[PDB]
Amino acid sequence: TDMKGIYSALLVSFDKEGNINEKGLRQIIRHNIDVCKVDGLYVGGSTGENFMLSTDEKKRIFEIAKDEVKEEIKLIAQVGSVNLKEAVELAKFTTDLGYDAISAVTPFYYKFDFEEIKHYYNTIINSVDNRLIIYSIPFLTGVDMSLDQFGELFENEKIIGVKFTAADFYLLERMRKTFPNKLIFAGFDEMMLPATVLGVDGAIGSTFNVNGVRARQIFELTKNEKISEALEVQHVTNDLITDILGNGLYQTIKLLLEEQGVEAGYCRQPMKEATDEMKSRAKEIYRKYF
Amino acid sequence: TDMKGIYSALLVSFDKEGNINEKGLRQIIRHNIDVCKVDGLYVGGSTGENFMLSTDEKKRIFEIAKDEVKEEIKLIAQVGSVNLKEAVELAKFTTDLGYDAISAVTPFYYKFDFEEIKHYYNTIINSVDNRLIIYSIPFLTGVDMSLDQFGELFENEKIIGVKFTAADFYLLERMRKTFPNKLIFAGFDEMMLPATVLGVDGAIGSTFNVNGVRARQIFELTKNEKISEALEVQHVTNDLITDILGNGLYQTIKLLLEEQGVEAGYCRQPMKEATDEMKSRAKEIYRKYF
Amino acid sequence: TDMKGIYSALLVSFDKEGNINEKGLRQIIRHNIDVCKVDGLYVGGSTGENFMLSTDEKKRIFEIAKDEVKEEIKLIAQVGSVNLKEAVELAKFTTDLGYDAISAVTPFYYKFDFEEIKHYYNTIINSVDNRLIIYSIPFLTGVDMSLDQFGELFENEKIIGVKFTAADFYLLERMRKTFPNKLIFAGFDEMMLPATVLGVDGAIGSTFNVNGVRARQIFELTKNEKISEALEVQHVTNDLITDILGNGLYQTIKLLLEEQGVEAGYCRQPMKEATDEMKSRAKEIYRKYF
Amino acid sequence: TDMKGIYSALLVSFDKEGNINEKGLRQIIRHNIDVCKVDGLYVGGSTGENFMLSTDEKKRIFEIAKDEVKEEIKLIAQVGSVNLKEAVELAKFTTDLGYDAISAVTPFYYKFDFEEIKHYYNTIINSVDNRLIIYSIPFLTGVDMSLDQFGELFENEKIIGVKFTAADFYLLERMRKTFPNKLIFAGFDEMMLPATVLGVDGAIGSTFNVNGVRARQIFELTKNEKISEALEVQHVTNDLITDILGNGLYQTIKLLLEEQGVEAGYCRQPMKEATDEMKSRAKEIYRKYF
């Protein structure tokens, strides 16, 4: 299965108490497929509040996602964790469920050296019959890998690509050039245009859950070299993203989904419950960009 | 239970497969009590490789520690996690086990604002009938709180203190003065002398698992104002820590324990296995300091 | 005078003792004008080793560049300094010499708040009959200004633009959209392509002293929306920049110039003298890209 | 001359326009010697707004300080600069004036490697018949040197010590132990107590310009190992420093001197002029501590 394309980092629906709302999650999934029209879903990423969940909850979410989606769009399961044993168990679980590929965030919290990071990745991919995408998000994990390091990880053919969520376009350009046979996904929605001209094979974002169409326009207009048109879309998109970040990223994307009849619900505590100011602000944003 | 004193951030023993060696763990605990003469154990912290473990593993460790220690020394359980639900679960579990106090690291990975950090802490301590200590350590989490932010936290009389794992002696001095009714624990073993003269109520450290005696000498001598003597101990203590750091912190402390018949074992992967060089080196360190 | 275009951050030639080599400076100037065909020169920047010089040395460089250029291409004078009085003295000197515009890096070393930085820029621009361009460069000064702060600075119509030397393409995109009437120059040579698709009005770089042709191509090709070709030139350019960076930026560009008969000379101590290895490598680089 | 002791980072008096107020400068000096009872003056440091001045102004201040002090107390001259040539010039100038020792901040702004920093320091001290004190302060420079690098620097017998202005007490302890023959000066006034128990040979501070008496008390009490008393004075001193920082470090110190008939004057622009609020707040602080 060719993985190129646009992927929504799947949001998960929780009730006020933090319980997973399967009905809501299924709606979010449906919205992404029928309304946002994304090529696939990225399940278990930062966007899905993955790290605030128990392993059994992670498995439930992977199950629901695969069940609702079936074979319509593609699926990438993020199974990274500070607990390698958990990451290995989740790789087998999602590989069995039929996920088209798996992804793993660089191990964090503790300060592992590269040798250890490599051991981590190889142990994950070498345990299942699947393909792995390296999840690199430096501003959260604090881990920054060089070009040669990525080269070492790529030694393994089962490691097919990387999700580049860093503002280093010099490194991105070097990656594109040094690894022509590897997939590179843009991780910053507000920087989709400059990333696409550097040759990314797709994008994985949290805002795609509601701004999927514009996202595809930017990506497509650019690939067709209608830059001035692409920049204009990126402009509106960034006006949208700016209000979202200003009003609380996750709460707001969910409130924007609610406005569309999707029961995206709450975020897991300690992520604040949306205030009245936030809800009213989220309503305005919907009126202005949708 | 007055919580002042010297606490070892309990190391855990793992077999070659990475699974908990209970016999080894009990020996580590016994070594701390009978040989290092520590006043208590800080269970579930970074030193215990806590964040690389599953919830069941954390629980088993909490039980083993309580069962082996019983009432001999004080016990603080670090139940912090990015998963607040798990944090509350472990808070109750350990409280039901008779732990003298609980501790929680600042929620990491995602970027939480103070309001949220304060909610996280209130939720934990308000769910059980115990006392909580704030685990700050910003060099791993990246979360730096101000004096007033600590004040807001200390607005809950069930939050009795803080484990200061920072090198800001200005903030340290401010807190000792601003909260004379709260406990303050030094977190940097190599800076024990300079922190004690500022009036901390004790220390929580990783190297205490083997260097507990010298740690007590630094702590006591300093409290008795025999600074010139406390410094000489700190000097030897720092020579030891410098060598342990250069050879691999966790792997070396365990190898130093193995040298004494304590089955400390391996470290949880992806933390590397000790090499022949490291093992030979650990032996040299043992002969030079023990 | 319309300031859009490709500007080389002028390098200065020094002999082994640190003396300004005038003959060599004029050759560097001629090379940029006659061979690299740049649209202008950015004098007194980091690349010109400006902050390692005395005020009168800076003055000599400004007069030399002015004289040698005649009226062939445009000229921008970097007059910023920790000493506001020197900045004002230099702004008047260069304005009187006929420089098309002045530039000023944010005051560094001491930690100034925005109010003070605003007073800094206003004091400079209000002292002369000229136009100013903000020199940001966050990695050497550690100063990060928000979009709103830039908004204030731009209140002054004499502050016509900013040299963007940061990797924040989100801020870049917002800058373009929010200030359509202000000039925005890219300061990162290895990211010219992604910066151009975002609407920058030109670029100011150190590598243009030798790669001005390819740099212009990347700019024009992108403007004409011929992305594929633009990316190819960026790739070869970044191959060059990577090698240069690995060998020693300033010393290597100067050695690349020496290979062409331009006596670019040494760098000012404490910047090291090129070693035999660096010189050998420099030759290889010249052969490979020129 | 033995350079141990309490040194005040000498403040400079400026008039509203920014001109050196020679009269007020002599009063600041007399105050430090007669009222603050310091052992010496550290001239031309950050506190002296040294980096916002021209070489001629720096020399003038050096002349005034030497003329006013005569041979009463010791004098250290900070001659560091991004311009190696200027530093050498100032090193000769101050040596000729009979300064007891010189000091040099690490070369900043540009990213010099260690080899180059070593060259910089050797060039300065090998140029005069004097002794040199390394000035670290990574808070404003961003230059972090290791124990081994300080080792190479100390290879030169003429490099007699280092002014430590970082919060790394680990490095401080290692330094004291590793270089028993070298001088170590504490640079953080609000951390004098914890630093002195580690064996620093003295201190250099900005707040000594008005708090020299208390500063001496902390230093001497700690040296006598009367910690409890030392901590009490550090507590009051830190209340003072906290108010000062809150109201504007440099402005407030000068205003506190004004209340005492010392024409400390203004700060050099772009450092903001004291507001009315600031001025009244300064009077309060004065009443509250003097």
The CATH superfamily of D1-290 is Aldolase class I (3.20.20.70)
Beta strands in chain A (DSSP E): 5-9, 40-43, 74-78, 101-105, 132-136, 159-164, 183-186, 202-205
Interface of D with B (CB under 8 A): 167-170, 173-174, 177, 188, 190-191, 193-195, 197-199, 222, 225-228, 230-231, 234-235, 238-239, 242
CA distance B44 to chain A (A): 14
**Which residue, A164, A160, A158, A124, is CA-closest to A144?**
A164
Q: Which amino acid belongs to residue A49? A: E
Q: Classify strands A183-186 and B5-9 as parallel, antiparallel or unpaired.
A: unpaired
CA distance D11 to D9: 7
The answer to whether the CB of C133 falls within 8 A of the CB of C103 is: yes
Question: Pick from D215, D221, D194: which is nearest to D203 by CA?
Answer: D215
Contact at CB, B198 and D197, closer than 8 angstroms: no
Catalytic residue among D99, D120, D135, D250: D135
User: DSSP letters of D128-160?
Assistant: SSS-EEEE--HHHH-----HHHHHHHTTSTTEE
What's the CA gap between A221 and D106, in Å, rounded? 51
Calculate helix-pair angle for C22-30, C55-69, nearest 10 degrees: 40
Do the chains contact at B173 and D195, CB–CB below 8 Å? no
Alpha helices in D97-226 (DSSP H): 114-126, 138-141, 147-153, 169-178, 192-196, 208-223
CA distance D236 to D288: 10
Element at A119 (helix H, strand E)? helix A114-125
Torsion angle of C-alpha atoms C264, C269, C270, C274, degrees rounded to 10: 40
The owner of tokens 């560009």 is: C253
- The single residue of B99, B120, B121, B135 carrying the catalytic annotation is B135
Q: CA gyration radius for chain A?
A: 18
Catalytic residue among C42, C99, C120, C135: C135
Question: What is the widest separation between alpha-carbon atoms in chain B?
Answer: 52
- State the sign of the Cα–Cα–Cα–Cα dihedral A80, A83, A88, A92: negative
Residue C46 among known ligand-binding residues? yes
Helix H, strand E, coil C: the string for chain C is CCCCEEEEECCCCECCCCCECHHHHHHHHHHHHHHCCCCEEEECCHHHCHHHCCHHHHHHHHHHHHHHHCCCCEEEEECCCCCHHHHHHHHHHHHHHCCCEEEEECCCCCCCCHHHHHHHHHHHHHCCCCCEEEECCHHHHCCCCCHHHHHHHCCCCCEEEEEECCCCHHHHHHHHHHCCCCEEEECCHHHHHHHHCCCCCEEEECCHHHHHHHHHHHHHHHHCCCHHHHHHHHHHHHHHHHHHHHHCHHHHHHHHHHCCCCCCEECCCCCCCCCHHHHHHHHHHHHHHC
What is the Cα–Cα distance from B213 to B236, expressed in whole angstroms? 12
The count of other CB atoms within 10 Å of the CB of residue A213 is 15
Alpha-carbon D222 to chain mean position: 21
What is the CB neighbour count within 10 angstroms for residue D139?
13
Give Cα C193 to chain centroid, integer Å: 17
Quote the minimal CA–CA distance from C196 to chain A in Å: 9
Give CA separation, B190 vs B202, B239, D211, in Å.
14, 9, 31
Distance from CA of C226 to the nearest CA of D (A): 37
With contact defined as beta carbons under 8 Å apart, do C168 and C141 qualify?
no
Q: Is B190 annotated as a binding residue?
A: yes
Contact D238 B190 (CB under 8 A): no
Pick from D115, D120, D270: which is nearest to C120 by CB?
A: D270
CB atoms within 10 A of CB C171: 19
Quick check: D170 and B238 CB within 8 A?
A: yes
Residue linked to tokens 């005649």: C70
Coil vs helix vs strand at B219: helix
Is B16 labeled as catalytic in the residue annotation? Answer: no
Name all chains with 3 or more CB-CB pairs below 8 Å to chain A.
Answer: B, C
* Residue corresponding to tokens 């679980």: A93
Annotated binding residue B204: yes
Is residue A204 part of an annotated ligand binding site?
A: yes
The answer to whether the CB atoms of A112 and B270 lie below 8 A apart is yes
Residues preceding chain discontinuities in chain C with C to N over 2.5 Å: none
Would you list which residues of chain A are within 8 Å, Cβ to Cβ, of chain B? Answer: 18, 46, 51-55, 82-86, 107-113, 115-117, 119-120, 123, 140-142, 268-272
Select from A198, A200, A231, A228 the least CA-distant residue to A214: A231
Residues shown for chain B: 290
- Inter-chain contact C269–D120, Cβ cutoff 8 Å? yes
Best of C47, C84, C153 to disrupt the D interface (most D CBs within 10 Å) is: C84
Determine the 3-state secondary structure of B42 from DSSP: strand
Q: Dmax of chain C from CA atoms?
A: 52
A269:B84 CB<8 A: yes
Way the structure was solved: X-ray
Residue position matching structure tokens 């992520």: A271
C253 is in an annotated binding site: no
Residues B43, B75: contact at Cβ < 8 Å? yes
Cα D200 to the center of its chain, rounded Å: 15
CB contact under 8 A, A84 and B115: no
- Are D191 and B173 a contacting pair at CB < 8 A? yes
Which residue bears the tokens 């031309």?
D44
Query: Residue D191 is nearest to which of B169, B230, B238, comparing CB atoms?
Result: B169
Given the residues D58, D74, D163, D182, the one annotated as active site: D163
Neighbours of C15 (CB within 10 A): 12
Q: Which two tokens stand for residue A234?
A: 């990126």
With touching defined as 3+ CB pairs under 8 A, do chains B and C touch? no
| Phi, psi dihedral angles at B200 (to 5 degrees) | -65, 160
| A47 marked as part of a ligand binding site | yes
Confirm whether residue C187 is marked as ligand binding: yes
Question: Residue D93 corresponds to which tokens in the numbers above?
Answer: 């100038």
Query: Per DSSP, which regions of chain D are E strands?
Result: 5-9, 40-43, 74-78, 101-105, 132-135, 159-164, 183-186, 202-205
Per-position b or e across A123-158, b if 16+ CB within 10 A of its CB = bbbeebebbbbbbbbbebbebebeeeebeebbeeeb
Surface-to-core class of residue B284, CB atoms within 10 Å of its CB (0-12 exposed, 13-18 middle, 19+ buried): exposed
CA distance D53 to chain C (A): 6
Task: Verify whether the Cβ–Cβ distance C85 to D271 is below 8 Å.
Answer: no
Which of D164, D178, D197 has the most B C-beta neighbours within 10 Å, making it the best mutation to test the interface with B? D197
CB pairs under 8 A between C and D: 87
**A185 by DSSP, 3-state: which?**
strand
In this complex, the chains that touch D, judged by 3 or more CB pairs closer than 8 A, are B, C
Nearest CA to C170 among C160, C162, C178? C178
What is residue A110's DSSP assignment? S
Residue D32 to residue D39: CA distance in whole angstroms: 9
Chain B residues bordering chain A (beta-carbon distance below 8 Å)? 18, 46, 49, 51-55, 82-86, 107-113, 115-117, 119-120, 123, 140, 142, 268-272
Nearest to B113 by CA among A270, C193, A55, D91: A270
Chain B: closest CA distance from residue D286 (Å): 21
Residues of B in contact with D231 (CB under 8 A): 197-199
Residues in chain D: 290
Angstrom distances, CA of residue D243 to CA of B196, C93, D78: 25, 42, 28
Q: Which residue among C195, C225, C235 places its CB closest to the CB of A227?
A: C225
Residue in the structure block whose two tokens are 């843009």: A186
Other residues' Cβ atoms within 10 Å of the Cβ of residue C179:
16
